[PDB]
Amino acid sequence: PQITLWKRPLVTIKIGGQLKEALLDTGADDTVLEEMNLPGRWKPKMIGGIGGFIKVRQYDQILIEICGHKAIGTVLVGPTPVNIIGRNLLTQIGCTLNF
Amino acid sequence: PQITLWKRPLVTIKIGGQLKEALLDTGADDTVLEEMNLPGRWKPKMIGGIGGFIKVRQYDQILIEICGHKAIGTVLVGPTPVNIIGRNLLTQIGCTLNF
Ligand SMILES: CC(NC(=O)OCc1ccccc1)C(=O)N[C@H](C(=O)N[C@@H](Cc1ccccc1)[C@@H](O)[C@H](O)[C@H](Cc1ccccc1)NC(=O)[C@@H](NC(=O)C(C)NC(=O)OCc1ccccc1)C(C)C)C(C)C
Ligand SMILES: C[C@H]1CCCC[C@@H]1O
Numbered sequence A, B: 001p002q003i004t005l006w007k008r009p010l011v012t013i014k015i016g017g018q019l020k021e022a023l024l025d026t027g028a029d030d031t032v033l034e035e036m037n038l039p040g041r042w043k044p045k046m047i048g049g050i051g052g053f054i055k056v057r058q059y060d061q062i063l064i065e066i067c068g069h070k071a072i073g074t075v076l077v078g079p080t081p082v083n084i085i086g087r088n089l090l091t092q093i094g095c096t097l098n099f
């Protein structure tokens, strides 16, 4: 797809058979999902944003489909207001910024 | 140009006669720069993100050059750790996500 920026770049993702809406976010190093249940063990991670820092759970090698493209990688889960797809997964799906 | 996402999409901008480095950010509704004085009047605004909300100063009709592409729009000024070029200006330079 080509996504313009007039509105937020929100796309459908699927993870654990569940469809969710998420933000394609070039200003995020990592992908951070709203609270939800994932499999396996997690490890702690702190991420910083505009208002300060939050603690999130890091899951590795997680299956996620983003607008139909499969990616397998790190997903953080925690108190984010919006599902955010970060550069770690945008790279796997071949996403670039162009002007 | 085409900007890959293996690293943060940092570019040179010019604003108020100053060169700065800023992040091309598809997940930002608004453009938010570190503390600076800009021409004209301002009004307070709260913006939210990972970690909560910060108070910023809003300036309107601000000229900016992003990678040598001119744009004009609202620019917010406050305690951000990174200069962020939001969708309000990414639209004007013809910026799109492609995969
Ligand atoms: C690891 C990392 N940053 C990093 O380098 O860490 C080092 C650091 C951190 C803090 C201080 C000093 C140094 C990073 O990738 N951070 C992401 C991030 O917050 N990125 C922000 C930019 C940034 C980059 C580095 C450091 C700090 C900030 C965004 O631009 C990012 O694109 C967010 C994503 C987002 C969208 C929507 C909701 C919440 C988060 N946008 C924003 O925060 C923008 N806010 C918005 O566009 C508005 C208006 N949002 C909004 O709707 O807020 C709703 C809300 C609801 C409830 C609570 C709070 C907010 C902002 C840049 C203007 C994160 C989501 C993984
Ligand atoms: C007018 C202002 C924005 C465009 C480039 C020069 C200057 O800093």
Ligand SMILES: [K+]
Pocket: A098, A099, B094, B095, B096
């Ligand atoms: K384009």
Ligand SMILES: [K+]
Pocket: A094, A095, A096, B098, B099
């Ligand atoms: K691409």
